[PDB]
Amino acid sequence: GPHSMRYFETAVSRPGLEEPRYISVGYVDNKEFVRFDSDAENPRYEPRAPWMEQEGPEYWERETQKAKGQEQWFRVSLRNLLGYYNQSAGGSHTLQQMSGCDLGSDWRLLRGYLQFAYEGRDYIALNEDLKTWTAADMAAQITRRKWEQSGAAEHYKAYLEGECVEWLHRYLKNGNATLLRTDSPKAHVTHHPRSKGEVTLRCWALGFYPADITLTWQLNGEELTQDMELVETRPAGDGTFQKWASVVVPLGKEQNYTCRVYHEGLPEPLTLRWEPP
């Protein structure tokens, strides 16, 4: 399967106080692995995955020191941004960054990744080429023109193809057991009676990991594209996920309808129907 590493950095300008709240969150295969939060009593990078504990208090120190340097980069970039958008504020402003790399199944680098957002809107992003930039608006053009002169793209390229990849290999090697793991969904259909001789058939999919799942309802062997009601894949809280899909079907004609659950953790795709005792 493919692998990814991402650092989800957030800087929230606090009005009054003259330093933001920096929050760097590390993910390896979409699973939180490390985390940094400036709002902590003793701010430092912490393991958020067990396999991350194999790392020496030496490694944490190198990262924590990087966070301190970012905590500043944001503060300045925040200030400068507030200028470009004429926002002089005793109001909070939020700058977010997503950096990292995607790998194939062979662990060979596929894509370098670097995006920035101001106020929840895309600001600037380095293109797939890891050479050119794309600015969202006129204010973002200042940063583009600033970074084209700086040659800043080259350092990010160097990190994303170099450090990012080399590192991700270590993490994948170290977390293999935890990472290769899949929790299969445990499904079931629930019968929810209603008016006009109709029933809601809820196909539940529970305790599965990864969050990627497909739920389909079938009448005699034809998908119910627009009839169907989903829910956004929600975390159980125990590390697994939940999702459900429902269809309004006429009474008695229940077993005419079939639910199919497609997940990578399944030994084969689950085919279900309302089983009344």
| Sites for other proteins among residues 162-221 (CB under 8 A) | 163-164, 167, 188, 190, 192, 202, 204, 206-207
State which of residues 64, 80, 87, 233 lies at the interface with its own copies (CB under 8 A).
87
Within 13 Å of residue 274, how many CA atoms lie on the same side as its CB? 24
Q: What character string, x for contact with its own copies (CB under 8 A) and - otherwise, covers 91-110?
A: xx------------------
Check residue 57 for interaction with other proteins (CB under 8 A): no
Cα torsion angle, 74, 75, 76, 79, sign: positive
Check residue 8 for interaction with other proteins (CB under 8 A): yes
Of 154, 157, 135, 24, nearest to 84 by C-alpha is 135
Residue 89's CB is within 10 A of a number of other CB atoms, namely 11
Q: What character string, x for contact with its own copies (CB under 8 A) and - otherwise, covers 2-41?
A: -------------x--------------------------
Residue reference for tokens 């005792």: 277
Whichever of 88 and 149 has its CB closer to its own copies, that residue is: 88
What span, in angstroms and rounded, lies between the C-alpha atoms of 143 and 139? 7
Cα Rg of the chain, angstroms: 24
As measured in angstroms, the least distance from the Cβ of 105 to other proteins is 21
Check residue 138 for interaction with other proteins (CB under 8 A): yes
Check residue 236 for interaction with other proteins (CB under 8 A): yes
Check residue 228 for interaction with other proteins (CB under 8 A): no
What span, in angstroms and rounded, lies between the C-alpha atoms of 38 and 10? 10
Check residue 90 for interaction with its own copies (CB under 8 A): yes
Taking CB within 5 to 8 Å according to partner kind, which of other proteins, its own copies, none is near residue 122? other proteins
Contact 112, 129 (CB under 8 A): no
Check residue 119 for interaction with its own copies (CB under 8 A): no
Which whole-number Å values give the CA distances from 135 to 36, 141, 224, in the listed order?
A: 28, 5, 41
State which of residues 47, 110, 111, 152 lies at the interface with other proteins (CB under 8 A).
152
Residue 59's CB is within 10 A of a number of other CB atoms, namely 14
Whichever of 120 and 277 has its CB closer to its own copies, that residue is: 120
Check residue 60 for interaction with other proteins (CB under 8 A): no
Whichever of 23 and 179 has its CB closer to other proteins, that residue is: 23
Contact 87, 207 (CB under 8 A): no
What span, in angstroms and rounded, lies between the C-alpha atoms of 141 and 242? 42
- In the complex, the residues that contact its own copies under the rule CB under 8 A are 15, 85-92
